[PDB]
């Protein structure tokens, strides 16, 4: 039975040597993979001239509600995924998470693009750099998409998520992908894929698929691609060297697996409720997903005083662990994908068994079984310094070993020595043996979670990486960062410092700098509609004398009686010199000059961005108030009866009689528009 | 003559076969380089067990006035550098931008450090982000400083500048540095070293250097590295497929060389003053450091009626161009730095006249004379797009090809086709083309000037990396970034996601996060002095009714008419259901509550951060504000006379009686010190 | 109280001067007729103002 491959917009297939995927609990092959003969090149070719200039015309705004209609047409449709997933041996709670995580993933990605993307094509991430003294040459960071494809180079462990948590940011970050998926699992990665592509949601070679070994692909990259990794280091580490991806300096952005520790503090001890959140969280994280999960804790450090009691409760809670058949009931842990995953991890227990111990059911796993079972295991090392297999030998399973410690100074040691991790976790209470551990232990972990009473209520675990932090330790785990929020579509942008003049800088980023050119025309900014908004378009206000009665009235209404404003005796020994008028009563008189008083477009305020007080407004001093537009921003109507609006940013810019700046900011506003969407 | 390298603490020297450096302008070796023999493994072991505790037990505060004392003593002695750079034929004015960027690099980090780095030795680069419903389990990103060194590799084009854009982010962000420079001009780079450790202020083992080969360095890193190279794509490419830099997954960052293009638009006509603008930055760049800078123009892209125009401009002003000795007066290009340079330069010049053109002086330069000189070179391409080796092959030196274009569409593809670029210049007045520009060539560039009229009178040039701007392209620009402000800090970092509940964050980061616990002590914070507030000493202030009355005192008071709050009508059609109270007044009437009246430490406030309104503050609706610290960064005390003193920023979270946040939002705080320390 | 008021400018009667010397601003006495009323639109306080409004090309 073929499984597909979508390439060039056609669901093709190839003609060669062929893997085939095997099931999981039961053992037959099902499905087949192939891709030989299929031209990767013309792949290559359709997703750079069809759905590349098709995705970078589009705006951001516009490119996270494809997202949303993804993750909402893909949300729909999940029953037929789970039947899929099943095949992997994985049980509905542990497919809950590859599905729904992904799926979150691309609500994540659709909030973040929503909320902090602008409507344009390009993304200035700075506000200003000032390079001159007269203020008629700056410089700005800008962010254009790439005009390439990206490679990803998925793994078996998830299919639906760690395809999706690749995708967002891929195509948030207006570029093309082409996902190859395992070829142990790939059949729920197609799933996925053809669930997106028999939508229209999607533009047309947006997105590729090649169910099988790729050969080809990888030897035929322009400059502007990026290839993204996750599987073994040994693997990685051969398409790092890859003569293409050094030859034309390619990103290559790898995550592999790691020692991941969970480490117990000196304080804890077995009366607490802390001790049975560590015992049930190491549990949890080695039982979920039969432990083949990147994030799994695989080096459990104790204090030497807690071994018996910590051995002898990951005794009393593993044993209640059945493993089985996913879909009969009483079945916890379900199975791993293949026989050969299944040799894998046990000729890996046969290394960590050449120097360690053994505390349970190890080594012991039947290999002529109709199915890829594996038990679940608990391992020991009595010198764990002294023992260099088990900070260097990981076994991709159930399996974890377990270790002493000396007194919070040799547990650092220990959780460092894994060469680079992936994710760690210290179970303590007292806050000051947290500090030390992030002191010394954040150089080699990618993601530490600090767990305690307190947290262990509403966490999402330890194996769950979340959609907006860091997924990517150093070292061993690759060094390539993922997921980071909107760090994650920075890595599909080329970051360009664009120099020039401001009024320039106005044009180019479409919007306002700080001494850009304006377009003054004879009425009021706030009764213009969303769309006869011009990032430009200023206002320069009446003014205002502030005066000795403006600090009185405004120190007696707010009841800000401070010293540089209401005592004169402690004014005259102040940095200022004198009474000074209140900061707040500038930013109030501010938005006394510029704001109509009608019923307009603008609805709200409800934000001010950066505000800096940088002279102070004295007695007999006149304020004279210059609002400009700075970005639009527009939002995207979720409901049909609600008003249609968006996000106008104006750059207010106060002055005095000898127009230097005091206290210049930038004001958040919800303009009504004039035409909807829906 | 040795050249003594400075590793373990002592100047040591090499043992065997040895390179010399010539004097460039008259052809004697003065110096002679080597590095065979030294203990490679024991330099990199010092380096880690002296100077990386010795920099990550200082704050990031103390790592930035460690910078300004390095700059302050390096300008100082700044003459005897002079001398060293006229051995490599460079002119006064050449090697003052060789100098004094290159402090001017240490003056800039030392003043992003400290005005936007912590007072402390994590680095939280994110606010917050809140992953429950109720509050208990949130996560930030901490950057923490690697453990181990920074092996950079220059080249011979700025060994002081090249270094020091080099050692200023490492040493900022807490990492020991091995310089490597280029052994054609090593002896700059050995003067610079010396001076910096003859000084006392660096820690031991906090800077090396291997004047000669590495040899067995790139052998012996641990995954705590960052390799950071500068110079040939072809040996950099050695570099990165180096089997242990791929086997621990150690950063590798490679600057290559490029082909910088300078596009001429259709707006600029002969009359226009762009015109002698264009081809006065042509020639300034392409003679500035002999055309010997790795932001060198090498491609003018001119449109097809302007060829002969810009071609006796260009020739017109560079035959004024005179080269020779720098020393004696009337001279304005220097030299070449080596002989074997000015052969490598004119195999490139006959492989570019191969397939193109000739306009002046290209090929005729004298092998045989006593010195490294190579005329000013201007090329001619008549057909851009049909010749493959004008954009694959650069002349690095003063060779800069030209060629036309056709109507800012072949422009366009002339400037994306040099596999990726380092920089590069439109010189238009018209702003749409220059958003075409960005829009569809910033992809292969990585710093682009708009050049126009108003920029050229303050522009800092084409060929001036800023020390706050992005210094790196893509492709064949190597694709690592550089310089770009806090982003050049951040690549010696290692950025950690940590988790836990809110008041474990608190304790981390030495801040406050949202809920943590709070240190309430019955009396009021802004009474206490900078070095006895501590991040959680809150305030939960007296409780003030907003009525009816303060709405119309404050719409009066500053003028602020709006709809929403003085008009009953439009209101209750509003979006709020009737009026509400101005959102700058509960801003002011905060304030009111936790501002003391008295004379305190408390010097000026300066600032706010950032505020939301969340929900709108109705007639009859209490406010109650809760003032709690979150920062303290102190600052150093330029001058003996001047106060001391800390910018505290202080979280201000005003609330209501059903507790619900209202206007959250935080204010910077000048708070005095105690004690001194300058 | 609770009584809104809306103001409704509109002029009336323009009547310029004849600058009686040659330094004084042109100007002309603009007479605005001010009709206040509230929200049933009944015209409470409605009255006249004069004003001396500049003028932008002078005669003599
Ligand atoms: N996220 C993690 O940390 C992961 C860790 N692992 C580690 O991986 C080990 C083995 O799992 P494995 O499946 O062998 O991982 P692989 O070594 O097979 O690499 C995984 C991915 O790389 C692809 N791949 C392999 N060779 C090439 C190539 N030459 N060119 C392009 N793509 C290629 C595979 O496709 P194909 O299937 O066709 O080879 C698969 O999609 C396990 O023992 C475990 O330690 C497993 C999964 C991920
Ligand atoms: N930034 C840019 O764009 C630059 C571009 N160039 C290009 O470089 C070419 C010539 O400069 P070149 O001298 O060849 O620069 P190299 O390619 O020789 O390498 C330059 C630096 O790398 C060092 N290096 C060389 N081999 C190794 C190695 N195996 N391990 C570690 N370090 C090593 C060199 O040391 P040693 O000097 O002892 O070899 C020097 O410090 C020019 O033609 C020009 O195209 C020149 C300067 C910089």
Chains 1, 2 share one sequence.
């Not at 299944?342 to 000729?347: I, M, S």
């Amino acid at each position: 039975q073929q499984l597909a491959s979508f390439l060039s917009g056609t669901w093709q297939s190839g003609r060669g040597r062929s893997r085939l995927i095997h099931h999981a609990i039961s053992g037959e092959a099902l499905w087949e993979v192939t891709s030989e003969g299929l031209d990767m090149a013309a792949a290559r070719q359709f997703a750079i001239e069809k759905g590349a200039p098709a995705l970078r015309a589009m705006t951001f705004i516009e490119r996270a509600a494809m997202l949303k209609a993804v993750a909402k047409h893909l949300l729909s449709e999940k029953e037929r995924f789970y039947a899929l997933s099943a095949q992997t041996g994985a049980t509905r709670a542990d497919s809950w998470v590859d599905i729904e995580g992904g799926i979150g993933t691309l609500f994540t990605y659709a909030s973040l693009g929503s909320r902090e993307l602008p409507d344009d094509t390009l993304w200035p991430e700075d506000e200003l750099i000032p390079l001159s003294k007269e203020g008629g040459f700056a410089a700005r960071h800008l962010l254009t998409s790439k005009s390439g494809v990206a490679v990803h180079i998925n793994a078996f462990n998830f299919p639906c998520w760690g395809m999706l948590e690749k995708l967002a940011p891929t195509w948030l970050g207006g570029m093309p992908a082409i996902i190859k998926p395992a070829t142990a699992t790939a059949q729920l990665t197609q799933a996925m894929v053809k669930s997106i592509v028999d939508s229209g949601l999607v533009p047309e070679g947006a997105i590729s698929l090649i169910c099988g070994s790729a050969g080809d692909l990888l030897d035929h990259l322009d400059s502007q691609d990026v290839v993204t990794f996750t599987g073994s280091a040994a693997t990685g580490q051969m398409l790092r060297v890859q003569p293409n991806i050094v030859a034309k300096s390619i990103p290559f952005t790898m995550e592999a697996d790691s020692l991941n520790c969970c480490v117990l503090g000196e304080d804890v001890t077995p009366d607490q409720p802390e001790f049975a959140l560590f015992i049930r969280e190491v549990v949890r994280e080695m039982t979920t997903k039969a432990g083949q999960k990147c994030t799994a804790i695989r080096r459990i450090i104790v204090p030497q005083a807690l071994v018996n009691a910590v051995s002898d409760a990951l005794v009393a809670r593993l044993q209640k662990v059945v493993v089985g058949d996913p879909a009969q009931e009483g079945v916890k842990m379900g199975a791993l994908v293949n026989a050969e995953q299944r040799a894998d991890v046990q000729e890996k227990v046969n290394i960590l068994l050449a120097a360690g111990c053994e505390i349970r059911l190890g080594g012991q796993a039947d290999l002529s079984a109709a199915g890829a079972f594996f038990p679940p295991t608990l391992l020991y090392c009595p010198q764990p310094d002294e023992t260099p297999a088990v900070h260097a030998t990981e076994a991709f399973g159930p399996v974890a070993t377990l270790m002493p410690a000396q007194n919070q100074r040799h547990a650092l040691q220990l959780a460092c020595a894994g060469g680079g991790s992936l994710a760690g976790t210290l179970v303590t209470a007292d806050p000051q043996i947290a500090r030390q551990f992030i002191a010394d232990a954040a150089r080699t972990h990618g993601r530490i979670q600090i767990l305690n009473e307190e947290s262990a209520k509403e966490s999402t675990g330890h194996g769950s990486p979340l959609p907006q932090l860091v997924h990517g330790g150093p070292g061993r785990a690759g060094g390539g960062e993922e997921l980071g929020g909107l760090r994650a579509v920075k890595h599909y942008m080329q970051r360009t410092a664009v120099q020039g003049s401001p009024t320039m800088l106005a044009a180019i980023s479409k919007q306002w700098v700080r001494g850009a050119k304006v377009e003054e025309d004879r009425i009021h900014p706030f009764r213009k509609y969303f769309e006869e908004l011009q990032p430009g378009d200023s206002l320069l206000t009446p003014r205002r004398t502030m005066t000795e009665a403006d600090i009185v009235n405004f120190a007696c209404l707010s009841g800000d009686h401070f010293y540089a404003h209401m005592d004169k005796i402690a004014a005259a020994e102040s940095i200022f010199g004198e009474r000074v008028v209140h900061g707040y009563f500038v930013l109030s008189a501010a938005a006394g000059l510029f704001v109509d008083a009608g019923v307009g477009p603008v609805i709200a305020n409800y934000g001010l961005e950066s505000l800096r007080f940088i002279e102070p407004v004295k007695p007999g001093d006149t304020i004279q108030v210059r609002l400009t537009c700075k970005r639009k921003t527009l939002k995207k109507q979720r409901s049909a009866e609600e008003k249609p609006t968006g996000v106008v940013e104006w750059a207010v810019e106060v002055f005095n009689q000898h127009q230097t700046p005091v206290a210049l900011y930038s004001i958040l506003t919800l303009v009504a528009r004039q035409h909807g969407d829906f």
